[PDB]
Design a protein around this motif. Structure first.
Motif, PDB file in Angstrom:
ATOM      1  N   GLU A 152      70.058   4.712   5.826  1.00 59.78           N
ATOM      2  CA  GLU A 152      69.917   4.996   4.414  1.00 59.78           C
ATOM      3  C   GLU A 152      71.231   5.332   3.757  1.00 59.78           C
ATOM      4  OE1 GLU A 152      67.508   9.164   3.942  1.00 59.78           O
ATOM      5  OE2 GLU A 152      66.439   7.512   4.973  1.00 59.78           O
ATOM      6  N   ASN A 156      74.097   9.673  -6.275  1.00 57.56           N
ATOM      7  CA  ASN A 156      74.048   9.440  -7.737  1.00 57.56           C
ATOM      8  C   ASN A 156      75.369   8.784  -8.142  1.00 57.56           C
ATOM      9  OD1 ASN A 156      74.272   9.907 -10.754  1.00 57.56           O
ATOM     10  ND2 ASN A 156      72.298  10.862 -10.407  1.00 57.56           N
ATOM     11  N   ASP A 209      67.873   0.264  -8.809  1.00 58.28           N
ATOM     12  CA  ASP A 209      68.113   1.727  -8.786  1.00 58.28           C
ATOM     13  C   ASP A 209      67.879   2.302  -7.369  1.00 58.28           C
ATOM     14  OD1 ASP A 209      67.195   4.640  -8.800  1.00 58.28           O
ATOM     15  OD2 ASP A 209      67.419   4.420 -10.970  1.00 58.28           O
ATOM     16  N   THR A 210      66.720   2.007  -6.772  1.00 57.54           N
ATOM     17  CA  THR A 210      66.375   2.513  -5.478  1.00 57.54           C
ATOM     18  C   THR A 210      65.477   1.479  -4.852  1.00 57.54           C
ATOM     19  OG1 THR A 210      66.417   4.799  -6.329  1.00 57.54           O
ATOM     20  CG2 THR A 210      65.316   4.447  -4.236  1.00 57.54           C
ATOM     21  N   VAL A 211      65.761   1.123  -3.613  1.00 60.13           N
ATOM     22  CA  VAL A 211      65.079  -0.011  -2.962  1.00 60.13           C
ATOM     23  C   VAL A 211      64.904   0.370  -1.491  1.00 60.13           C
ATOM     24  CG1 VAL A 211      65.275  -2.390  -2.354  1.00 60.13           C
ATOM     25  CG2 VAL A 211      66.276  -1.659  -4.481  1.00 60.13           C
ATOM     26  N   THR A 226      66.652   2.505   3.055  1.00 58.00           N
ATOM     27  CA  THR A 226      66.463   2.875   1.676  1.00 58.00           C
ATOM     28  C   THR A 226      67.844   3.020   1.103  1.00 58.00           C
ATOM     29  OG1 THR A 226      64.405   4.070   2.172  1.00 58.00           O
ATOM     30  CG2 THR A 226      65.492   4.642   0.111  1.00 58.00           C
ATOM     31  N   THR A 230      70.904   6.506  -7.559  1.00 57.95           N
ATOM     32  CA  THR A 230      70.629   7.742  -8.259  1.00 57.95           C
ATOM     33  C   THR A 230      70.287   8.870  -7.299  1.00 57.95           C
ATOM     34  OG1 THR A 230      68.266   7.162  -8.627  1.00 57.95           O
ATOM     35  CG2 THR A 230      69.879   6.652 -10.409  1.00 57.95           C
ATOM     36  N   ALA A 231      69.622   8.573  -6.180  1.00 61.16           N
ATOM     37  CA  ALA A 231      69.120   9.645  -5.355  1.00 61.16           C
ATOM     38  C   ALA A 231      69.954   9.834  -4.110  1.00 61.16           C
ATOM     39  CB  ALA A 231      67.683   9.360  -4.987  1.00 61.16           C
ATOM     40  N   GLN A 232      70.495  11.038  -3.926  1.00 60.26           N
ATOM     41  CA  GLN A 232      71.130  11.397  -2.654  1.00 60.26           C
ATOM     42  C   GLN A 232      70.158  11.163  -1.527  1.00 60.26           C
ATOM     43  OE1 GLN A 232      74.524  12.904  -0.522  1.00 60.26           O
ATOM     44  NE2 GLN A 232      74.251  12.423  -2.705  1.00 60.26           N
ATOM     45  N   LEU A 233      70.607  10.525  -0.454  1.00 56.00           N
ATOM     46  CA  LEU A 233      69.803  10.408   0.787  1.00 56.00           C
ATOM     47  C   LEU A 233      70.558  11.053   1.958  1.00 56.00           C
ATOM     48  CD1 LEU A 233      68.638   6.778   0.273  1.00 56.00           C
ATOM     49  CD2 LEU A 233      67.382   8.851  -0.251  1.00 56.00           C
ATOM     50  N   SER A 234      69.974  11.025   3.158  1.00 52.15           N
ATOM     51  CA  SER A 234      70.660  11.688   4.283  1.00 52.15           C
ATOM     52  C   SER A 234      71.922  10.926   4.730  1.00 52.15           C
ATOM     53  CB  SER A 234      69.723  11.934   5.464  1.00 52.15           C
ATOM     54  OG  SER A 234      69.479  10.678   6.064  1.00 52.15           O
TER      55      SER A 234
END
Ligand SMILES: O=C1O[C@H]([C@H](O)CO)C(O)=C1O
Ligand SMILES: O=C1O[C@H]([C@H](O)CO)C(O)=C1O
Lengths: 331, 331
Positions: A152, A156, A209-211, A226, A230-234
């Motif tokens: 992943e 942002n 944006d996010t997939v 993933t 926009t979204a912080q992931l691990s």
């Protein structure tokens, strides 16, 4: 030495030029740079100690001193720059993703192949000592028979100008998902998926944006990833089998730690340069050194990112973004 | 006190009985236990200080002293035990997954509803202080608008006898995926997915081995999970939005740490019992306390795992395992 010409003068090119200029001088020399006008180029060449400066890429192509061209341009500008360099007989290391869709890739690869010239996509992650160790763990069968891979990458990046730009082919997939697809391809032997499933949303600037993506691989193993702007992931990647898990820790796209069945290993970056534009930017040395070895052995492509795999990664990415409706002019 | 009857005497029942026996004695009392024969029951009752022992479940149902029955049986034996208890007018806390397919769940829920009696699925994870804090972070909008959830749970459980047993409805989904589905349902408001996609493989004993699932949720957010009975995974769960990520660390199915935008919080388990059969088994207290509060307020179901959500989780799981062909007798 391997004589490098740098194509374009933006942030990625600084990092790369900076890295090349830390390498043994009998091994690598940066002998030219080209920008879309002479002043941008002359300023870059002073800042970075490059003897020759040009106000077009065509002039850098035609320079008989350059043996290999580093194509640092923005996403939609790679193809024409790569094509110019190949036509003029230069070896090319092209920034990621090589092209914006599969046909751009196929077209670069066919040109390189037919001119008998080296071409490599600069998926720098693959040459990190931590990734190499991951390949070795896979080769040794340490994890048992494989079962599942996962990766992943999200942050942002909505205030990073070019990251969310429709005109510059930005978006999660082309900026960040590329790292996920390559990781998953690497662990499953560069094999072609049997099936892909995709969910994601668009971003209000015209890009993805996010997939999240599910890939069925042969032999009853699959992976998923993933990515997001926009979204912080691990920001880690793992593969697992009947005997355990191996994981590249955050930052997985330029990793310095590998955990294999609970056992941690660290692989320090070269000490220089510091103050790179991009995090861990010193790890670019690994791929520069790689390009020189291939060229020295007379290879026309890298065994680590073979062109037929660059084509498949581009097939995958384009299929992914088509499944959720995201299109560019070039399609 | 809330007077508990324990149904079946295996490992999970020890843990639960052990936990209940650490709670304030004016709040909870274990007053009966039932097994499939009298000796197994009498031995359990001595070991655990339970005044009454029975050699059938029907006898525990009919005991007028029991107010609530804890159904600790193996997966395929829940439905008939729950049904006996409801018929005899007992409130029921039923181990997870409540039933092996959606119809078993629907049937338990319809019986409870029609008798005006409390029924709850013992998804113990939901009552951990770390999960409650996760809900609060979601309610407060701390992560921004949501984008993606992720959860994974795998271990090599191939030498855990009942975990890989076709006859006992074992497999990754029913032992471990249940935790993933509930986590993902929790973060997206218990809403029904719009679309599901599944890849996985079977295990040579007749059950599912490793399964990844993609769930499209309303409002353009999705989640995915991977579960396995052979491959160790990271065993964490995260949700992310435009302002950051919240993550329950390993062990995510009984979590004691929450990281929200880099900030760590720890939530210690009760000090007793130690030496539980299952890791973190003391956290079962949270749900026991929960059942008493609901019953004290006269609730016929939990607001935290409402029966209509138990039905949806069972719909999801059964759709998942049907997509990859795994069937049980009960279908
Ligand atoms: O500067 C960085 O480099 C990455 C790029 O997005 C990937 O090349 C990232 O997000 C950083 O911290
Ligand atoms: O004993 C444990 O409890 C879990 C169970 O599989 C889930 O209830 C697990 O794998 C342990 O360490």
């Amino acid at each position: 030495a391997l004589r490098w010409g740098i194509v374009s003068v933006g942030l990625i090119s600084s990092d790369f030029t900076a890295v090349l200029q830390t390498l043994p001088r009998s091994e690598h020399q940066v002998v030219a740079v080209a920008a879309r006008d002479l002043s941008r180029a002359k300023e870059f060449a002073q800042k970075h100690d490059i003897p020759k400066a040009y106000g077009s890429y065509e002039e850098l192509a035609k320079d008989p001193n350059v043996e290999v061209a580093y194509v640092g341009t923005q996403h939609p500008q790679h193809k024409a720059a790569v094509m110019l360099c190949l036509a003029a007989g230069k070896a090319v290391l092209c920034e990621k993703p090589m092209g914006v869709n599969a046909a751009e890739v196929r077209e670069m690869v066919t040109e390189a192949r037919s001119r008998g010239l080296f071409l490599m996509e600069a998926i720098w992650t693959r040459f990190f000592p931590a990734s190499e160790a991951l390949r070795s763990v896979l080769a040794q069968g340490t994890l048992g028979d494989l079962r599942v891979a996962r990766a992943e990458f999200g942050k942002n990046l909505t205030h990073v100008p070019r990251a969310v730009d429709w005109a510059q082919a930005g978006g999660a997939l082309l900026d960040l998902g590329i790292y996920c697809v390559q990781f998953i391809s690497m662990v499953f032997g560069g094999q072609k998926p049997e099936k892909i499933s995709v969910m994601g949303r668009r971003h209000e600037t015209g890009v993805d944006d996010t997939v999240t993506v599910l890939l069925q691989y042969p032999g009853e193993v699959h992976g998923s990833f993933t990515c997001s702007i926009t979204a912080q992931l691990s920001n880690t990647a793992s593969v697992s089998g009947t005997k355990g898990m191996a994981q590249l820790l955050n930052p997985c796209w330029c990793p310095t730690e590998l955990v294999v069945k609970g056992e941690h290993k660290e692989f320090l970056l070269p000490p220089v340069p510091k103050n790179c534009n991009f995090d861990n930017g010193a790890g670019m040395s690994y791929e520069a050194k790689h390009v020189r070895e291939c060229l020295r052995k007379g290879l026309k492509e890298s065994p680590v990112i073979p062109l037929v795999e660059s084509e498949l990664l581009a097939d995958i990415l384009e299929e992914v973004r088509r499944a959720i409706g995201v299109t560019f002019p070039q399609d």
